[PDB]
């Protein structure tokens, strides 16, 4: 009774339901996972075809924040694009005062600080977004971070967002973190995303794979789906 | 179960519910004759209701999907005379937040204005019409949006 309204307010259980609602609202978005190999980080997204509806290659939740750092987001899309402007400008500031690549830890810490800062006040709402963050450097290696609408910033070798989450990150234990090269994890995550998410739930969908690491020399972009085209080849035969 | 005294006027009734938990607890013989339960809202519960002899398989029943919505609504209209031009795609997408029961209401209204029309057979303009009828409500006026 009124304890769900403002994020400024506590509750008889000692938490905020604004964060709970926002959290479980992110769960309704399409499943987008990520994983990191020894030589880089493999982002992957499943974008749904609803009616037609419109041109392919639009509103992709895969973003590029920096030359070496990009987004794979899920949840409310507008707030996620806003967060892409946020981190974009933050990397511009680090580049401004210092002039080299932002260590992923500090970037995720700043975004975590904002996301936290919007959970304390009834002026704004808690953010409806949860995204993957990954980067690579030779003085660092392949790092992956997972950020939640509450503002907790930690890291994984791989993580799972969207409706199918636990059942999707389950068999990711079969994917080995170091031993497996990234060019193989392309078709690995392809087979996870294609094999998970039963086609009756959504009649048609597609697969998007973005990638950053050593093979591209630190550049973060989509490893082109027409390049290797290994999802469909393997994933279609992988249903059995 | 409410909270604390006094008083739960159902404390005897919910007490009988905890007696059902005794028939599921201190006595096994209920292993025969499976008993099924249904609730429109899971808001309030006996938290002890979680068990295989107690509530086990728990399934969320969502809003039907446009495929399933046009399917079940087509099952309600399959007996009635329908002019063989219906998308079910157009109105399947026109079904937003609908309950399948409001798809039934779409059929029922289709027959309703199908009456006043005098047309012996149901038409698609009648479908979208009844859709507008039941949902969403009314009314205001057409203005300001040009």
């Amino acid at each position: 009774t009124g304890y769900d309204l403002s994020a400024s307010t506590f509750s008889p259980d000692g938490r905020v339901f604004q964060v709970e609602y926002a959290m479980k609202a992110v769960e309704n978005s399409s499943t987008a996972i990520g994983i990191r190999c020894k030589d880089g980080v493999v982002f992957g997204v499943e974008k749904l075809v609803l009616s037609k509806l419109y041109e392919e290659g639009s509103n992709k939740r895969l973003f590029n924040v920096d030359r070496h750092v990009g987004m794979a987001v899920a949840g409310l899309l507008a707030d996620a694009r806003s967060l892409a402007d946020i981190a974009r400008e933050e990397a511009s500031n680090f580049r401004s005062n210092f002039g080299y690549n932002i260590p992923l830890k500090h970037l995720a810490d700043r975004v975590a600080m904002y996301v936290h800062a919007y959970t304390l006040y009834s002026a704004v709402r808690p953010f409806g977004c949860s995204f993957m963050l990954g980067s690579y450097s030779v003085n660092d290696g392949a790092q992956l971070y997972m950020i939640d609408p509450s503002g907790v910033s930690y890291g994984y070798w791989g993580c799972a967002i969207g409706k199918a989450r636990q059942a999707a990150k389950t068999e990711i234990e079969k994917l080995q973190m170091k031993e497996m090269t990234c060019r193989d994890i392309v078709k690995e995550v392809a087979k996870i995303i294609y094999i998970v998410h039963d086609e009756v739930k959504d009649k048609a969908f597609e697969l998007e794979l973005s990638w950053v690491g050593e093979l591209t020399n630190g550049r973060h972009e989509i490893v082109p789906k027409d390049i290797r085209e290994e999802a469909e080849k393997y994933a279609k035969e992988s249903l059995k | 179960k409410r909270f604390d005294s006094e008083k739960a006027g159902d404390r005897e009734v919910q007490r009988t519910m905890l007696e059902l938990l005794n028939q599921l607890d201190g006595f096994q013989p209920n292993t025969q004759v499976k008993v099924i339960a249904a609730t429109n809202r899971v808001d309030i519960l006996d938290p002890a209701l979680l068990r295989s002899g107690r509530l086990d398989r728990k399934i969320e029943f969502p809003m039907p999907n446009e495929e399933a919505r046009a399917r079940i609504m087509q099952i309600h209209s399959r007996k009635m005379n329908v002019s063989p031009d219906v998308n079910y795609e157009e109105l399947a997408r026109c079904t937003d937040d609908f309950n399948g029961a409001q798809c039934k209401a779409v059929c029922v209204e289709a027959g309703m204005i199908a009456l006043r029309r005098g047309a012996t057979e149901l038409t698609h303009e009648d479908y979208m019409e009844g859709i507008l009828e039941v949902q969403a409500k009314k009314k205001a006026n057409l203005q300001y949006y040009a």
Binding site: S51, E55 | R93, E125, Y145
Partner: protein, 238 residues
């Protein structure tokens, strides 16, 4: 329903009803269908008036030589975001002395519409914007929403019973990328003409049409300008 008070509140299901009611504000506007080919891009909009002598209220309005827009919803925010749009145009058109690529432009629309979608005691904007423009990669047809999430299409529509216009779209819209401007325009009015109940036109003054092309600057066409586009039409069946 008290949790639908303002934008700030997340519903028990996690859906702010303010943006939903803004969508329902968009659905009340007069239908319009934008579309593009592999070369040319066209949008078509139908006016609605208050009475006889009252002028049919226009939708399509020119913005920049390479970019026009359609509209639905509140005329206030329409002219407002339109002004901010002129601004954005003359910005790069000033400093960079080049036109504006549509993509980054519409992301600027999303950033401008974003903040009112969150802060306490704020509202979104009732918007039926349909954008058509040419950067170096040619035609674009976008669309907006009160939630500030934009889509890129070959053809989309908003307003009253605009999904029926899409049910006309699906069939021929693989062909819409081929034919030239004229018959593409009559494909467009073939998409709008079902948004009307079948007992009325589809006249001259009640409809607004706009076309832009690769080497063709965006121009609004109405009345005598659409009379060539409205002629040579086969009437809908009965």
């Amino acid at each position: 329903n008290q949790y639908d008070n303002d934008v700030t509140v997340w519903s028990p299901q996690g859906r702010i009803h303010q943006i939903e009611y803004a969508m329902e504000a968009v659905k009340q506007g007069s239908a319009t269908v934008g579309l593009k080919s592999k070369t040319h891009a066209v949008l078509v909009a139908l006016k609605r008036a208050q009475s006889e002598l009252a002028a049919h209220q226009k939708k399509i309005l020119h913005v920049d030589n390479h970019i026009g827009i359609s509209i639905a919803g509140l005329t206030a925010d329409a002219r407002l975001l339109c002004n901010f749009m002129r601004q954005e145009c003359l910005d790069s058109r000033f400093v960079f002395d080049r036109p504006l690529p549509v993509s980054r432009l519409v992301s600027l629309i999303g950033s401008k519409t974003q903040i009112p979608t969150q802060r306490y005691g704020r509202r979104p904007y009732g918007v039926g914007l349909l954008i058509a423009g040419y950067d170096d990669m040619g035609p674009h047809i976008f669309q907006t929403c009160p939630s500030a999430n934009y889509f890129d299409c070959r053809a989309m529509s908003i307003g009253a019973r605009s999904q029926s216009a899409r049910t006309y779209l699906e069939r021929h819209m693989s062909e819409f990328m081929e034919c030239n401007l004229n018959e593409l325009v009559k494909h467009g009015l073939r998409a709008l003409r079902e948004t009307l109940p079948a007992e009325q036109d589809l006249t001259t003054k009640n409809v607004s049409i706009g076309i832009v092309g690769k080497d063709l600057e965006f121009t609004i066409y109405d009345d005598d300008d659409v009379s060539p586009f409205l002629e040579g039409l086969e009437e809908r069946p009965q």
